[PDB]
């Protein structure tokens, strides 16, 4: 049932943080990176994915 539905169901079941990923979650981080609050950060890839990227082997 389409690539995106699988990825999302998977993310919500295996990600360390079991919550819905809202566009505003990415928005708040974008907001921070665009502000002067993050003056010492550049050239980085920041992960805003409820931490799914740290997982190797799933529980189920």
């Amino acid at each position: 049932y389409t690539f995106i539905d699988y990825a999302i169901e998977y993310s919500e079941k295996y990600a360390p943080l079991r919550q819905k990923l809202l566009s505003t979650d990415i928005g708040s981080v974008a907001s921070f990176l665009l502000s002067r609050e993050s003056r010492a950060i550049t050239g980085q890839t920041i992960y805003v994915d409820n931490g799914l990227n740290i997982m190797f082997l799933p529980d189920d």
């Binding site: 690539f3 995106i4 505003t24 981080v29 502000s35 890839t45 799914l52």
Partner: protein
């Protein structure tokens, strides 16, 4: 006096919108870059109040959209546009939609900005797996999704203040294999992440500007449903 230009919006169901919403919370003026093909439809829904609820910033605030302009990331300058599009029913009633053109337009109307958001991605053969992607599709994916970031920086750095910030959106498919993310999109994201580092060097040393990329998790957006696998 913060002004942010968001390159890559067609609706309120993607990341560009969520970013715009959050930036408004902080009183930053927003300028949307809308892809010509959906520009008029977008203005229609905007004018018919179809986005009104989506513009309410929780705290009784209203999203402050400074402007909305047709924008196609696949054209750097005016003389880069071919006949086929120059005669397209959509691009006809439109002008000044190339990267250099919108930067000049923005600079002229509002002056310098200090925030840029690259939130666009496109790939003709995104449905095919890497092995079956043609040279044409692969390059079209990297042209629209990767190089577009470099071109944005090259032209907008002239209308940006020192200490401005830039971000783009990427996906983990660039580092680990996720089947279904084809058409050269994983390749383009891998390039976008590498270029972010390189651009950080050039933009940081020469203009004191920062650039980062956000690797986001899944989100049910229009272009997300487009991926068939």
């Amino acid at each position: 006096e913060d002004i942010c230009f968001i390159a890559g919006i067609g609706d309120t169901n993607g990341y560009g919108w969520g970013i715009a919403k959050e930036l408004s919370k902080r009183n930053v003026k927003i300028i949307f870059g809308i892809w010509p093909p959906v520009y008029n439809i977008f203005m229609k829904n905007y004018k018919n109040g179809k986005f009104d609820n989506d513009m309410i910033i929780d705290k009784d605030k209203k999203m402050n959209i400074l402007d909305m302009l047709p924008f196609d990331a696949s054209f750097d300058t005016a003389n880069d546009i071919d006949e086929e599009t120059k005669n397209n029913k959509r691009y006809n009633m439109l002008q000044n939609y190339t990267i250099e053109d919108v930067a000049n337009l923005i600079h002229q109307k509002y002056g310098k900005i200090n925030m840029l958001v690259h939130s666009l991605a496109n790939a003709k053969e995104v449905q095919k797996d890497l092995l079956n992607t043609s040279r044409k599709g692969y390059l079209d994916a990297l042209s629209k999704s990767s190089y577009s970031l470099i071109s944005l920086c090259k032209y907008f750095v002239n209308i940006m203040k020192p200490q401005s910030s830039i971000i783009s959106l990427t996906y983990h498919a660039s580092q680990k294999v996720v089947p279904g993310y084809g058409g050269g999109m994983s390749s383009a994201k891998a390039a976008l992440e590498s270029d972010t580092r390189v651009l950080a060097y050039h933009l940081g040393r020469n203009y004191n500007i920062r650039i980062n990329t956000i690797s986001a998790g899944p989100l049910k957006s229009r272009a997300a449903t487009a991926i068939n696998k």
